[PDB]
């Protein structure tokens, strides 16, 4: 229903949306994982740069 001067709402919450919700509490944790991998990769390519031209 509508009762006052409103913007007509369109909220797409008519499926079972609660089954597919992705929070990100691992944002700082994944950042640590990426930095460890970059450090290990740089050591393997000992004098070479870590990129391509």
């Amino acid at each position: 229903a509508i009762k006052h001067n409103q913007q007509i709402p369109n909220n797409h919450f008519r499926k079972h949306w609660q089954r597919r919700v992705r929070c990100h509490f691992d944002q700082p944790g994944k950042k640590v994982t990426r930095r460890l991998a970059r450090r290990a990769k740089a050591a393997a390519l000992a004098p070479r740069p870590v990129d391509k031209l």
Binding site: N5, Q6, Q7, I8, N10
Partner: protein, 183 residues
């Protein structure tokens, strides 16, 4: 019984600021004293505007000041209980002295580079404790995006609450005579 239409009627205007700024409280104490111990009508007006909320203290620009510095006001002191902003459209700034609640960084720099000076509202009370040779300026109250929506209705030409702009958003029935009627 006493047969009265009204009883215990409260006042419609603010009596103190709603902010918790410590320095604003010191400023309010100063002008409470001035308004009680002086006959100047100028002091009472400044006290009331220190209680007001931000939508009742719209900003004032350098262009709006320059408009009112004409026709014999070149040497008066401009008083603004609000923020003073800069205007890119104005290419040459005249020299003036302004007392304001606060200045933006570019507004302050352009006033002083043209030979003027900026004051604080407590410096103003020390130099002009009665408000002599001053002019009070207010900004445009209704120049707010929300006021354009007020009082919407038939034959009112106000702005509607819509989520987008285009041909598919509220332009067909009730807006033209080729689909029913118009407003």
């Amino acid at each position: 019984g006493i047969d009265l239409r009204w009883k215990h009627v409260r006042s419609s205007h603010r009596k103190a600021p709603k902010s918790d700024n410590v320095y604003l409280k010191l400023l309010v104490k100063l002008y409470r004293f001035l308004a009680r111990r002086t006959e100047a009508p100028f002091n009472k007006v400044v006290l009331r505007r220190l209680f007001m909320s931000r939508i009742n203290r719209p900003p004032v620009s350098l262009s709006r000041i320059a408009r009112n510095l004409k026709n014999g006001n070149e040497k008066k002191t401009v008083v603004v209980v609000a923020t003073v902003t800069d205007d890119n459209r104005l290419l040459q700034v005249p020299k003036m002295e302004v007392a304001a609640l606060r200045f933006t960084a570019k507004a302050r720099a352009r006033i002083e580079a043209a030979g003027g000076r900026t004051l604080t509202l407590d410096q103003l009370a020390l130099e002009k404790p009665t408000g002599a040779n001053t002019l009070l300026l207010r900004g445009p109250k209704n120049a707010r995006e929300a006021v354009k929506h007020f009082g919407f209705g038939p034959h009112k030409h106000k702005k509607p609450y819509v989520r987008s702009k285009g041909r598919k958003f509220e332009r067909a029935r009730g807006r033209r005579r080729s689909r029913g009627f118009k407003v």
